[PDB]
Design a protein around this ligand. Structure first.
Ligand code: NA
Ligand code: NA
Ligand code: NA
Ligand code: NA
Ligand code: NA
Ligand code: NA
Ligand code: NA
Ligand code: NA
Ligand code: NA
Ligand code: NA
Ligand code: NA
Length: 271
């Protein structure tokens, strides 16, 4: 049993080298072993909320039959940066399921804002959904892209590593979504395209990982949260969030990967 103090000191050295703050929370879903470091401190969500937005859409669909196959047109809409899928499909519109997949797997901003506008009731509505699953920490205050400002000590558009991990655990393995909807959500996480250098980089290529990244573009602020399915072990839920004090500092994918490696080494997994 690696003493938790050992794990904490490895993370302190890592965040000192990085020049900022690293916050982590992990849960072993078989043993209920947990580990946290800065787990109750707030960090900006950046795009990480989009995974929960997809979940909010699936939840909504459980009380509105047919919702996922409905199409949303936006032919004369002003489109946001980092909207690769919705920019491409503007001539056709997209179904609610397609928007949800895009916002999670490609971090698509147009898709996020469209779903917040037309289905989820804005940042307020997103926040209310999280409250409805027992998350009293998450808060979405602003839309894309202004939510990326990541100002030191601004609690808007933040959560904590613990609350992110706990909410991921609730959605992946709990009671919020029915079986079909829960499978859909986790398949979307599994097919995420933006996380190859973050938590996925800390585990063997043959383990299965579902994740969603966040990158604010300022204040060295970036993150990842995931479910990890090791070979012959219960799944692990992990959240890793970072920040740096200078606005022009870049984040580091390597640092997120290394934080993930340190934390996972602390679970008794065959790798
Ligand atoms: Na110490
Ligand atoms: Na529901
Ligand atoms: Na459904
Ligand atoms: Na799709
Ligand atoms: Na709020
Ligand atoms: Na405001
Ligand atoms: Na849970
Ligand atoms: Na085993
Ligand atoms: Na499982
Ligand atoms: Na910080
Ligand atoms: Na400073």
């Amino acid at each position: 049993s690696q003493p938790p103090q050992v794990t904490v000191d490895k993370l302190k050295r890592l965040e000192n080298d990085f020049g900022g703050r690293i916050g982590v929370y992990a849960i072993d879903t078989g043993s209920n072993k947990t580990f946290g470091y800065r787990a109750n401190e707030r960090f900006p969500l950046c795009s990480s909320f989009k995974g929960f937005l997809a979940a909010a859409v699936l939840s909504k669909s459980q009380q509105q039959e047919g919702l996922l196959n409905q199409r949303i047109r936006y032919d004369n809409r002003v489109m946001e940066p980092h909207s690769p899928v919705t920019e491409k499909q503007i001539t056709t519109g997209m179904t609610v399921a397609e928007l949800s997949a895009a916002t999670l797997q490609y971090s698509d901003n147009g898709a996020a804002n469209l779903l917040l506008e037309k289905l989820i009731g804005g940042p307020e509505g997103m926040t209310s959904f999280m409250r409805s699953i027992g998350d009293n920490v998450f808060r979405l205050d602003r839309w894309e892209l202004e939510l990326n400002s990541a100002i030191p000590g601004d609690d808007r558009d933040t959560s904590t590593p613990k609350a992110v991990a706990e909410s991921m655990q609730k959605l992946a393995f709990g009671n919020v979504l029915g079986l079909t909807e829960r499978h859909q959500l986790m398949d979307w996480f599994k097919g995420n395209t933006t996380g190859g250098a973050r938590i996925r980089a800390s585990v063997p290529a043959n383990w299965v990982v579902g994740d969603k990244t966040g990158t604010c573009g300022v204040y060295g602020t970036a993150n990842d949260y995931a479910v990890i399915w090791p070979v012959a072990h219960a799944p692990i839920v992990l959240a890793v969030y970072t920040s740096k004090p200078d606005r022009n500092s870049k984040h580091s994918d390597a640092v997120i990967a290394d934080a993930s490696r340190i934390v996972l080494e602390s679970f008794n997994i065959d790798a």
